[PDB]
Amino acid sequence: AKRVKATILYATETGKSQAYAKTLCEIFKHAFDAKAMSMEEYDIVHLEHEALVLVVTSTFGNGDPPENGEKFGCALMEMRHEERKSYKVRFNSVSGPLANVRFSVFGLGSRAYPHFCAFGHAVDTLLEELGGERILKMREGDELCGQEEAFRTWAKKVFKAACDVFCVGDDVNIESNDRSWKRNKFRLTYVAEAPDLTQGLSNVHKKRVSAARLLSRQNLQSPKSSRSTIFVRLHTNGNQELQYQPGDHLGVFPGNHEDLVNALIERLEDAPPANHVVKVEMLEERNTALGVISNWKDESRLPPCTIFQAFKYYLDITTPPTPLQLQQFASLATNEKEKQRLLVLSKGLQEYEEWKWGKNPTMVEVLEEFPSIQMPATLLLTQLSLLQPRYYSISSSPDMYPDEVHLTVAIVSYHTRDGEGPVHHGVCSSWLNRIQADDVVPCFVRGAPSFHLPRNPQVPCILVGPGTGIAPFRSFWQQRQFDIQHKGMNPCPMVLVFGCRQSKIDHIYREETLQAKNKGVFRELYTAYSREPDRPKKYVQDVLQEQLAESVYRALKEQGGHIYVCGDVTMAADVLKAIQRIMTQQGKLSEEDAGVFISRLRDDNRYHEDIFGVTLRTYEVTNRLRSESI
Amino acid sequence: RVKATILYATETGKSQAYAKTLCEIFKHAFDAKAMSMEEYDIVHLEHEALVLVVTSTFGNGDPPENGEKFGCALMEMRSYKVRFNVRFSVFGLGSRAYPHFCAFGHAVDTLLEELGGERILKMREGDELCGQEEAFRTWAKKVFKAACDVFCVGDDVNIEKSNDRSWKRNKFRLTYVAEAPDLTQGLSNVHKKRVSAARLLSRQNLQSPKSSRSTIFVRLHTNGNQELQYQPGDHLGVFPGNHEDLVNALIERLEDAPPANHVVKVEMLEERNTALGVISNWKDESRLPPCTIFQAFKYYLDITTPPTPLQLQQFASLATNEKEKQRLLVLSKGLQEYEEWKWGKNPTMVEVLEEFPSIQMPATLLLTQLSLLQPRYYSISSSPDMYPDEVHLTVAIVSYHTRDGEGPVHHGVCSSWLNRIQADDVVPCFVRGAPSFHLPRNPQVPCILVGPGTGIAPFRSFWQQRQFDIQHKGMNPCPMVLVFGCRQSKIDHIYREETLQAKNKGVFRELYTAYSREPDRPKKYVQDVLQEQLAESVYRALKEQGGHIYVCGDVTMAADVLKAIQRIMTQQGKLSEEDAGVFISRLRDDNRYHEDIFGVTLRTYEVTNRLRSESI
Numbered sequence A: 001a002k003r004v005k006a007t008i009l010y011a012t013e014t015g016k017s018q019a020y021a022k023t024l025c026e027i028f029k030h031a032f033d034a035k036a037m038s039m040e041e042y043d044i045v046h047l048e049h050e051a052l053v054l055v056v057t058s059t060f061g062n063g064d065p066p067e068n069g070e071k072f073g074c075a076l077m078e079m080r081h082e083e084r085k086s087y088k089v090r091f092n093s094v095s096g097p098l099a100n101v102r103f104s105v106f107g108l109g110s111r112a113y114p115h116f117c118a119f120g121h122a123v124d125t126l127l128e129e130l131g132g133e134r135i136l137k138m139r140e141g142d143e144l145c146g147q148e149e150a151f152r153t154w155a156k157k158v159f160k161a162a163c164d165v166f167c168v169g170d171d172v173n174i175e176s177n178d179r180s181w182k183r184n185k186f187r188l189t190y191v192a193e194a195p196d197l198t199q200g201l202s203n204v205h206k207k208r209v210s211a212a213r214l215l216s217r218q219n220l221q222s223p224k225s226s227r228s229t230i231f232v233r234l235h236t237n238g239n240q241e242l243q244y245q246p247g248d249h250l251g252v253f254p255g256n257h258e259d260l261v262n263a264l265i266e267r268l269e270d271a272p273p274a275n276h277v278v279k280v281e282m283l284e285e286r287n288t289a290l291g292v293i294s295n296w297k298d299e300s301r302l303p304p305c306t307i308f309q310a311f312k313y314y315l316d317i318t319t320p321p322t323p324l325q326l327q328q329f330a331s332l333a334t335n336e337k338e339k340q341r342l343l344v345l346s347k348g349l350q351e352y353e354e355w356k357w358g359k360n361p362t363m364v365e366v367l368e369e370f371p372s373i374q375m376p377a378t379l380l381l382t383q384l385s386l387l388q389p390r391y392y393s394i395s396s397s398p399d400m401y402p403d404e405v406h407l408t409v410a411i412v413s414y415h416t417r418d419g420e421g422p423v424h425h426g427v428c429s430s431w432l433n434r435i436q437a438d439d440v441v442p443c444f445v446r447g448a449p450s451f452h453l454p455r456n457p458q459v460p461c462i463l464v465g466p467g468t469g470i471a472p473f474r475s476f477w478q479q480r481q482f483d484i485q486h487k488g489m490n491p492c493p494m495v496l497v498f499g500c501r502q503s504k505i506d507h508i509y510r511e512e513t514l515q516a517k518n519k520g521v522f523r524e525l526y527t528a529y530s531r532e533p534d535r536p537k538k539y540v541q542d543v544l545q546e547q548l549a550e551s552v553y554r555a556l557k558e559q560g561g562h563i564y565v566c567g568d569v570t571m572a573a574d575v576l577k578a579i580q581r582i583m584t585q586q587g588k589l590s591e592e593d594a595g596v597f598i599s600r601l602r603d604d605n606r607y608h609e610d611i612f613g614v615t616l617r618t619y620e621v622t623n624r625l626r627s628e629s630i
Numbered sequence B: 001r002v003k004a005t006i007l008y009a010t011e012t013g014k015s016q017a018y019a020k021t022l023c024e025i026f027k028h029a030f031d032a033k034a035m036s037m038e039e040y041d042i043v044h045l046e047h048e049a050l051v052l053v054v055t056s057t058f059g060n061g062d063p064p065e066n067g068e069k070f071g072c073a074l075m076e077m078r079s080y081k082v083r084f085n086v087r088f089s090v091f092g093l094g095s096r097a098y099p100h101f102c103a104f105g106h107a108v109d110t111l112l113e114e115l116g117g118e119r120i121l122k123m124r125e126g127d128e129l130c131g132q133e134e135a136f137r138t139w140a141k142k143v144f145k146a147a148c149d150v151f152c153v154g155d156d157v158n159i160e161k162s163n164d165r166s167w168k169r170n171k172f173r174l175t176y177v178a179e180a181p182d183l184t185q186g187l188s189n190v191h192k193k194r195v196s197a198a199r200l201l202s203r204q205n206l207q208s209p210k211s212s213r214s215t216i217f218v219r220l221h222t223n224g225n226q227e228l229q230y231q232p233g234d235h236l237g238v239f240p241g242n243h244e245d246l247v248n249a250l251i252e253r254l255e256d257a258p259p260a261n262h263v264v265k266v267e268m269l270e271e272r273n274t275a276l277g278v279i280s281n282w283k284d285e286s287r288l289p290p291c292t293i294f295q296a297f298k299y300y301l302d303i304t305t306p307p308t309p310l311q312l313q314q315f316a317s318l319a320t321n322e323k324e325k326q327r328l329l330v331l332s333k334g335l336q337e338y339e340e341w342k343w344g345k346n347p348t349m350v351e352v353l354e355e356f357p358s359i360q361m362p363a364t365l366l367l368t369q370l371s372l373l374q375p376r377y378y379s380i381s382s383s384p385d386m387y388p389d390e391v392h393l394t395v396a397i398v399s400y401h402t403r404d405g406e407g408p409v410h411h412g413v414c415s416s417w418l419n420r421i422q423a424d425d426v427v428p429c430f431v432r433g434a435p436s437f438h439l440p441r442n443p444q445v446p447c448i449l450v451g452p453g454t455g456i457a458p459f460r461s462f463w464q465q466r467q468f469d470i471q472h473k474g475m476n477p478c479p480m481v482l483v484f485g486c487r488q489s490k491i492d493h494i495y496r497e498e499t500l501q502a503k504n505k506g507v508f509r510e511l512y513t514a515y516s517r518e519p520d521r522p523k524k525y526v527q528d529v530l531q532e533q534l535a536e537s538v539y540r541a542l543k544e545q546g547g548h549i550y551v552c553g554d555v556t557m558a559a560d561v562l563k564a565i566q567r568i569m570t571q572q573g574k575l576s577e578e579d580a581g582v583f584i585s586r587l588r589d590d591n592r593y594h595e596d597i598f599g600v601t602l603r604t605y606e607v608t609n610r611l612r613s614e615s616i
């Protein structure tokens, strides 16, 4: 029972928890026999016999487990569950089998969301009730301020605390450094077989990606708008992989703009032409009883391909470097002043914060700001993060549009340095806005069972969502419309609470919702204008408290109706207060009965929320929170 | 060298094996490669010099799943059901027990031509029931020489054709690992598809206790798993566990030393020749995940399917006797001797090692040469609207005696596993849509549901759905007709009270049952109820009412039914066997005549024999 095993479990949606977990395993390799596994890869049957367990997990959606964390969270939730309390009740709330085990939790999250680091807190809370002995109190990493930084602190303490408790680490010492990057470690070797895009992305992200097809794209806003929102039609080609129900999302895999990809490639020192199928092989120095066995292997992260296809379809080249990545960049800088700035930023303290949040630098902008960096083709290919797919609410009814998938996409573009800097185009939205019909569209369907229309047609539904948060409601109404016209049903009509900036500029799908109302689908259509010169600023929160307070109340309290909120997390949080008020001031219930009534609706799946994350007033919201919390 | 792309389609993995071997032969005179019709750009096709196609046919003449993309691509680039139900040559695996024999291979062969394609050799067929591996080896040599001269290489090593990718003794080793994945995750890695962990809620027999046979009702909980969303008509792919006794008998007969409780992995020696030796390293085989050998045999590997001729030859060089090593050699040549052996005894791997006890079996040969345990498909018997977060299955428990009922009992792998797993045990499975076996979008048209025994399975979701659209969505769909079939009304009438009830609620207009072993009345099949009781309701539906007819179950039955309806078209409406037969062709492409083939599930022994006798 020597060489204590340290099991590092992680859950992630974009790769941050996974990275930190790797870094954490590397550290524990010093005094312990450590392993880093995704929560889904791990077999819950070993847990009770685990000596030490370290959890690094983010939280997603509406205070939920990352998708690859759901199974593990249910499992715990199960072993621990005499009856009561739901996950949504205790951990995302409105205001022993593991005796042998020692653990500690680090959770990633954002103060921009209601239930900050919810999944980390549930796991942390749950391992303790199951009989586990917590080493360090749970620490939280805020994506808005010092996330990578707070990881180090905790990583340091927890290691020290583990060494102390297990009484090992009298030979491990006070301390880049690991599988980071080193020139005699990674090598790009030639290959003659380059997979197909959708097949390569399936390997890379361990899931089946189907090739969809672009049929058309149209502007949903006036040509006189400064903004742009596009209606996109895709042909699924029969593929049963792409079956969906109204409410579900489509995950899409973009391509970085070629110019940016090229600028980047033309800045590498030693790099084959940006065209030669090259696999990446790494010098892996294993270790045996004989001594140390060293040899070449396949990194096996990216599939065989040209560096161009790699930077274009598989690697994140626009997300600002983490402090770690800057550290590897620094040791490549050949200019005194130019290299110290790199080391100052490597800290993740304020300078980093200001630089990142101020310049929102792409990989290219960084190499160009510190032109004395000798960038190795293999450092990027192995250190950059994978290009993540972006999710989009499906905007079509599969009955009204068989073998078709529609999307409503806000075109993200903004100026850096608070309007002074150049333009940065969102990766997926700008891609979806320029692909041609011959272009393949890598995607998959991710069902959203908490956001499907009710099984019972005769109950009232209130659909709340500003801007593109209307996207899924378009599948709701098209679907209800088809039901009426062809299935011979008379479902209780619904109410739509939309919200935008200007009557004849932003009200997307206006006529389309009109036509749907005349057909019985909707009882009434409410709209909140926020930048109308002719009146005051109104938000769906307002339309709800000023013109539906009664309907809302009668719908939810007597008619057994449902309310659906979709879009920006700030709005959704506001809509939850507007409803808590309407419930209080329209039924005489304190912040108690109103809160518990809501908390009940959710419980019974009658209060639905589909969070897009932070999409509205991004600058002002991120700015307020960033500051206010440091 | 010329580049030869060998494209293969496969479900149970036989065509895959054939292509990899085909690749090892074409290596001699060509630059040959092998991959799925999915792991390939259909755009590169036209820029190919030589394309070899090895593909099986599934469904009812349908392309295997991984051969769906490719199929329609050649179709548009150049309906399917109608017609079939660069240099290149096709070899299609199949079975003469199915109507549209090698339908996919014959379709791909036809369409390649219609795309600037020149055929080398006449497309061959490989009947799973008689001389499959035999016709392949042949066509294999005949097409090699054929392309060899077509592309003009002269006198080269045309005698080399037991090859290289075949197990040797220091090309493989089992290195310990202290971290083995969870089963469902391991399976997702092995089969490259998302497999979810579902849990058993309950199982109950739907046949009378006084029955000799047995069918079970199975309820699984999806656990809110979005990956497990389905529609009535869809199938659930399930991964079972082999029985422990057979797993431990197999381990205890093993030569290699791996304790069974230790996690291991299979590394293979990757060597790259040089001018004075070789530059090499041990890479992970990476077919199976790290797991205990007990777990590989119980959950990842097929230890019951009879050894192929290729796997026997290998056992040959491992027998320490002479008769044994010789019988092995005889059987290694998939001919009369081997076919009689296999079909007659249908030996598990364990029985093979016991019929030939001098074989010294190393663990790394089984772990690398045995086929992957394939998942079994089951028609979902529940409506998702009626049973949220639930998946129900109707499962016939397969169990037969070898050597024509004279030998030991052999249990169906998945059916028997599903028949003994305990509540809450994990059930790895996934959902595979059947877009061609879904209820019509128009619920105001009549549907005629035909299917005996377990063939009823998808209809229980059809009628639970309709019952739900009625009792809850407030719609009034055109009532349906159920044409069922079983052995004895008092024994085999599974879900009798349920279909009965579905009638009382307006789901079903009428319920027609056919019995085949009622010791009173004659042996009536469902094809006999169509003609002898509804020949008119069927004609009016498929001709005037814009109706739909769904056929589900054994391929033989489904065929007797097609040939029946085609006549009900002649007789009742007056059109010839080419005017009614092609009208059903228009039905199957208009998607109003639905078929869902389970394979050969009925009268297996009787049927598959006459068929061996058919071709032989």
Ligand SMILES: Cc1cc2nc3c(=O)[nH]c(=O)nc-3n(C[C@H](O)[C@H](O)[C@H](O)COP(=O)(O)OP(=O)(O)OC[C@H]3O[C@@H](n4cnc5c(N)ncnc54)[C@H](O)[C@@H]3O)c2cc1C
Pocket: A249, A318, A360, A390, A391, A392, A393, A394, A408, A409, A410, A412, A414, A415, A425, A426, A427, A428, A429, A430, A468, A471, A610, A611, A612, A613, A618, A619
């Ligand atoms: C379940 C779900 C459903 C969704 N459905 C939809 C949908 O239906 N329709 C839709 O349009 N979107 C939807 N989204 C949002 C969407 O997926 C993408 O986040 C969005 O299109 C932007 O992606 P991008 O790839 O274009 O830009 P990305 O390049 O990734 O860039 C966005 C990042 O830009 C920064 N950026 C943006 N604005 C500014 C600014 N003003 N100032 C400084 N920096 C800024 C932020 O740091 C932000 O994270 C959904 C998200 C989720 C999780």
Ligand SMILES: Cc1cc2nc3c(=O)[nH]c(=O)nc-3n(C[C@H](O)[C@H](O)[C@H](O)COP(=O)(O)OP(=O)(O)OC[C@H]3O[C@@H](n4cnc5c(N)ncnc54)[C@H](O)[C@@H]3O)c2cc1C
Pocket: B235, B346, B376, B377, B378, B379, B380, B394, B395, B396, B397, B398, B399, B400, B401, B411, B412, B413, B414, B415, B416, B454, B457, B596, B597, B598, B599, B601, B604, B605
């Ligand atoms: C789309 C689809 C849907 C299906 N739906 C269902 C369903 O809903 N319900 C259901 O019960 N089944 C269904 N099946 C059949 C099912 O999937 C399995 O084939 C079946 O349960 C048996 O699997 P097993 O794994 O138990 O036996 P397996 O071990 O694979 O064994 C069967 C093999 O045994 C031989 N064997 C069987 N009987 C005999 C005999 N009498 N004499 C000599 N040799 C014999 C055959 O060679 C056969 O291949 C479906 C198949 C498909 C393709």
Ligand SMILES: NC(=O)c1ccc[n+]([C@@H]2O[C@H](COP(=O)([O-])OP(=O)(O)OC[C@H]3O[C@@H](n4cnc5c(N)ncnc54)[C@H](OP(=O)(O)O)[C@@H]3O)[C@@H](O)[C@H]2O)c1
Pocket: A229, A410, A411, A412, A413, A414, A415, A466, A467, A468, A469, A499, A500, A501, A528, A529, A530, A531, A539, A540, A541, A570, A571, A572, A574, A615, A616, A617, A618
């Ligand atoms: N700044 C840029 O150049 C730029 C460019 C591309 C995309 N983007 C971003 O990408 C997003 C996509 O646009 P979109 O179509 O979804 O919507 P949008 O036009 O940004 O706004 C949606 C509507 O909801 C309102 N709203 C804002 N905050 C709210 C809150 N906290 N609670 C309730 N309602 C609220 C808005 O009011 P307001 O009048 O207050 O906005 C607006 O009327 C944009 O909203 C924007 O943040 C910005």
Ligand SMILES: NC(=O)c1ccc[n+]([C@@H]2O[C@H](COP(=O)([O-])OP(=O)(O)OC[C@H]3O[C@@H](n4cnc5c(N)ncnc54)[C@H](OP(=O)(O)O)[C@@H]3O)[C@@H](O)[C@H]2O)c1
Pocket: B213, B214, B215, B396, B397, B398, B399, B400, B452, B453, B454, B455, B485, B486, B487, B514, B515, B516, B517, B523, B525, B526, B527, B554, B556, B557, B558, B560, B600, B601, B602, B603, B604
């Ligand atoms: N051979 C065995 O002893 C044995 C035992 C247990 C399970 N099994 C297998 O497991 C399967 C599951 O049983 P099941 O519930 O699906 O059904 P089943 O009991 O095998 O029979 C389904 C019904 O369909 C009839 N039928 C048979 N062949 C037909 C054809 N060619 N065309 C139209 N109708 C036909 C049968 O009549 P008949 O009376 O003419 O068969 C029977 O009444 C079995 O059918 C069988 O394959 C076999």
Ligand SMILES: Cc1cc2nc3c(=O)[nH]c(=O)nc-3n(C[C@H](O)[C@H](O)[C@H](O)COP(=O)(O)O)c2cc1C
Pocket: A011, A012, A013, A014, A015, A016, A017, A018, A057, A058, A059, A060, A061, A062, A063, A064, A066, A108, A109, A110, A111, A113, A114, A115, A116, A117, A118, A143, A611, A612, A613
């Ligand atoms: C749609 C979306 C929903 C999110 N929901 C929450 C949330 O409820 N609580 C929280 O603390 N953070 C939330 N976040 C922030 C992530 O948890 C955080 O960005 C984290 O750094 C991502 O970590 P990962 O890369 O490991 O998955 C959310 C982010 C997105 C894009």
Ligand SMILES: Cc1cc2nc3c(=O)[nH]c(=O)nc-3n(C[C@H](O)[C@H](O)[C@H](O)COP(=O)(O)O)c2cc1C
Pocket: B009, B010, B011, B012, B013, B014, B015, B016, B055, B056, B057, B058, B059, B060, B061, B062, B064, B093, B094, B095, B096, B098, B099, B100, B101, B102, B103, B128, B597, B598, B599
């Ligand atoms: C449900 C099912 C349906 C089948 N349908 C056909 C068919 O229409 N035509 C044919 O020639 N073979 C058919 N077969 C036989 C396969 O083509 C044959 O068993 C082949 O050996 C499987 O090869 P594979 O393992 O490479 O996919 C079918 C087999 C099953 C299990």
Ligand SMILES: O=S([O-])[O-]
Pocket: A369
């Ligand atoms: O300051 S740099 O971006 O020129």
Ligand SMILES: O=S([O-])[O-]
Pocket: B241, B242, B243, B244, B420, B421
């Ligand atoms: O094989 S069953 O007992 O898990």
